[PDB]
Amino acid sequence: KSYTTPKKNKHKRKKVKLAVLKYYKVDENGKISRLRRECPSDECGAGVFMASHFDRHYCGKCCLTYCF
Amino acid sequence: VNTALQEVLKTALIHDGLARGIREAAKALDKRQAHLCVLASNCDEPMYVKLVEALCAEHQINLIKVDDNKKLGEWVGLCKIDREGKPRKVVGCSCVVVKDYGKESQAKDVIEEYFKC
Ligand SMILES: [Zn+2]
Numbered sequence: 313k314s315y316t317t318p319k320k321n322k323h324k325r326k327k328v329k330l331a332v333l334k335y336y337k338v339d340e341n342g343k344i345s346r347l348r349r350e351c352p353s354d355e356c357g358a359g360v361f362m363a364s365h366f367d368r369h370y371c372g373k374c375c376l377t378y379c380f
Numbered sequence: 381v382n383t384a385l386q387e388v389l390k391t392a393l394i395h396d397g398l399a400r401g402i403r404e405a406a407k408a409l410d411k412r413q414a415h416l417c418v419l420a421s422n423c424d425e426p427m428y429v430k431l432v433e434a435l436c437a438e439h440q441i442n443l444i445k446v447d448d449n450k451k452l453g454e455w456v457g458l459c460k461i462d463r464e465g466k467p468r469k470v471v472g473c474s475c476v477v478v479k480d481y482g483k484e485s486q487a488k489d490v491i492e493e494y495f496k497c
Contacts, residue, residue, distance in 0.1 A: 330428065332402045332403070332406075332428075332431075333427070333428065333431055335406060336431075338427070338430060338431045338434070342434050342437070342438070344434075357407075357410060357411060358410050359406060359407035359408075359410040359411060360407075
């Protein structure tokens with residue numbers, strides 16, 4: 313059962329509808345425009361996308377923190 | 381030829397030939413492993429039609445038109461429960477790209493004949 317202490321929440325994947333158009337910027341001419349970077353290593357390809365932070369960056373599985 | 385596409389997609393389901401999902405569609409188009417894909421036309425898509433036409437006409441990808449979104453998932457099998465008859469709880473998918481391995485088949489000859497010309 314439960315104690316007096318409240319239970320701890322967990323990071324669940326929230327349901328967002330049609331986020332695939334957030335991958336590339338859909339322009340007029342048929343050329344893909346991208347706002348994100350990729351992982352330049354050969355372990356993960358460009359099909360794997362990255363974590364969009366504001367100053368630092370994250371690879372797919374390599375955990376390589378790309379900073380300025 | 382609808383039975384031919386059904387046989388090709390079912391064999392892709394058997395041998396995991398098809399790369400289902402718009403996520404895996406982006407993976408396959410990034411790695412250039414797009415043998416074929418099926419696109420639903422005249423649907424209620426708000427703005428996805430231009431992006432998916434750009435994906436379907438990017439680099440050596442055929443243009444295939446079907447009628448509705450959720451009936452495409454019946455071919456690819458999102459909610460294949462109660463296989464004895466009509467499924468009663470089905471959500472749908474937009475498009476499915478394939479990566480065919482066992483290309484030597486019966487009707488795949490006329491499929492690639494229509495694909496070349
Ligand atoms: Zn990596």
